[PDB]
Each structure stands twice: as structure tokens, then as C-alpha cells.
Amino acid sequence: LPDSVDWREKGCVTEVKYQGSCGACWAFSAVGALEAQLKLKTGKLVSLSAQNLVDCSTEKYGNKGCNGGFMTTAFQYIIDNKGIDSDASYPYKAMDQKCQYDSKYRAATCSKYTELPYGREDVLKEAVANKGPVSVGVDARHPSFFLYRSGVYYEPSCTQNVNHGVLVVGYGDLNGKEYWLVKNSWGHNFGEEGYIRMARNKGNHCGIASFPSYPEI
Numbered sequence: 001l002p003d004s005v006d007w008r009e010k011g012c013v014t015e016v017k018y019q020g021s022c023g024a025c026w027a028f029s030a031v032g033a034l035e036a037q038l039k040l041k042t043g044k045l046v047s048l049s050a051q052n053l054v055d056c057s058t059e060k061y062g063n064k065g066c067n068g069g070f071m072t073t074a075f076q077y078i079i080d081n082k083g084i085d086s087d088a089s090y091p092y093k094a095m096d097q098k099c100q101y102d103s104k105y106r107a108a109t110c111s112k113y114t115e116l117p118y119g120r121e122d123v124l125k126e127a128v129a130n131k132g133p134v135s136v137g138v139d140a141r142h143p144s145f146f147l148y149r150s151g152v153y154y155e156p157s158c159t160q161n162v163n164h165g166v167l168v169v170g171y172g173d174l175n176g177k178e179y180w181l182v183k184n185s186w187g188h189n190f191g192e193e194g195y196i197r198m199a200r201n202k203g204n205h206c207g208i209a210s211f212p213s214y215p216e217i
């Protein structure tokens with residue numbers, strides 16, 4: 001496997017988004033993963049609608065819109081629905097709204113998704129290298145997480161009780177510290193222009209490899 005990977009270098013990662021006061025991280029994580037596959041498949045990089053998931057992948061999928069959701073069930077909604085609209089056609093409002101999906105604005109489809117084995121950082125490395133960015137959940141409730149600015153994030157108080165959906169878009173090594181390159185959805189002001197390098201091969205730190213999954217087209 002490559003020693004390092006950065007899907008941004010392959011033009012497979014869209015701009016960092018700002019979720020605001022709506023707990024839609026799960027939807028942003030999910031569209032981010034599909035965005036990479038859509039690019040790999042069609043050659044075009046297109047932001048997908050996080051709002052479409054918030055408003056439509058709801059109760060039937062165990063999701064609660066601005067109050068939380070799952071990347072896997074969001075993927076299943078896209079499969080069941082036979083599509084997801086583009087972000088431009090169905091903009092993000094950081095609010096729960098009525099479902100307004102319209103196939104005329106469809107920008108991507110999904111045929112299946114895969115959930116990786118719990119806590120295997122080696123399997124996650126292989127997936128990130130051979131398949132593309134992977135949706136994951138991390139424990140981002142510690143004060144240090146909100147204040148992260150640079151370097152590789154390692155928090156002794158971190159746990160494997162995850163609560164925030166993000167996207168691994170690569171991995172590597174910085175000054176002797178292995179890390180996972182994570183795309184967050186708290187805008188460009190957060191961390192490194194919206195990204196955070198989180199400790200890799202450090203005992204499933206913050207549960208980064210606890211619940212990984214990726215869609216395919």
C-alpha cells in the first residue's frame with residue numbers, strides 16, 4: 001500500500017462545508033464519500049446535497065435530521081431512492097425541512113455500501129488507498145478537538161465512544177507521527193482549512209476506525 005494518500009490531490013474532494021447549528025455531520029460525511037466515487041466514475045467533481053439527506057433520509061432510516069443520523073443508512077436511502085440531488089439544486093439550510101427530492105436534479109446514484117471491520121486501522125488504510133475516502137465516526141467531544149490548529153491530534157482523554165461523522169480522505173506521516181487526514185464539516189475556520197490530522201495506529205484513537213463505511217456506484 002502507498003505510504004501516504006491524499007484524495008484532494010486527485011481532485012476527488014469538494015470544498016469544506018459549514019454545517020452550522022444543525023447536527024448534519026452524518027449527511028456531510030455521507031455525501032463526501034459519494035462525491036469521491038462520483039468523481040472516480042464520471043470524471044466530474046460535484047458537491048452533493050446534505051440537505052436532501054436531512055429532509056428525506058429520515059425516520060425510516062433511523063435518522064433524525066439536525067438531531068443526528070447514520071452514514072450507512074443515508075447510503076441505503078440513496079440506494080432505495082435511486083439517487084441524490086446536487087447541493088446546488090437542493091441547498092443546505094441547516095434546518096429540518098420537508099423532503100423536496102426531485103429526480104430532475106439528481107447528480108449521483110449509489111448501488112451498495114460496505115462497512116469495515118470494527119477498529120482495524122490496517123483495513124481502513126487499505127480501503128482509503130484502494131477504494132477512496134471513507135466515512136467514519138470519531139469521538140470529537142473533547143475541548144481539545146474544537147481548538148485543534150495543526151500537527152497531529154492526539155488526545156489522551158479520547159475514547160472509542162464516537163459521536164461525530166467525518167470523512168477520511170487520506171493518511172500519512174508528519175514528523176514521525178502517523179495520521180489520518182480528516183475532512184470535517186465546521187467550515188474553513190476549523191483546524192487546517194477545515195481538516196484535522198488525527199493519530200493513526202495509536203490504538204484506534206478517538207474511535208476513528210470503529211465504524212468506517214464507503215459507498216460505491
Ligand SMILES: N#C[C@]1(NC(=O)[C@H](CC2CCCCC2)NC(=O)N2CCOCC2)CCN(Cc2ccccc2)C1
Pocket residue numbers: 019022023024025026062063064066067068069070071136137138139140141162163164165211
Ligand atoms: N453533527 C453531527 C452529530 N453526530 C451525529 O449525527 C452522529 C453520527 C454517527 C456516525 C456513525 C458513528 C456514530 C455517530 N449520530 C447521532 O448523533 N445520532 C444517530 C441517529 O440518532 C440520533 C443521534 C449530531 C450530534 N453530535 C454532537 C457533537 C458535537 C460536538 C462534537 C461531536 C459531536 C454531532
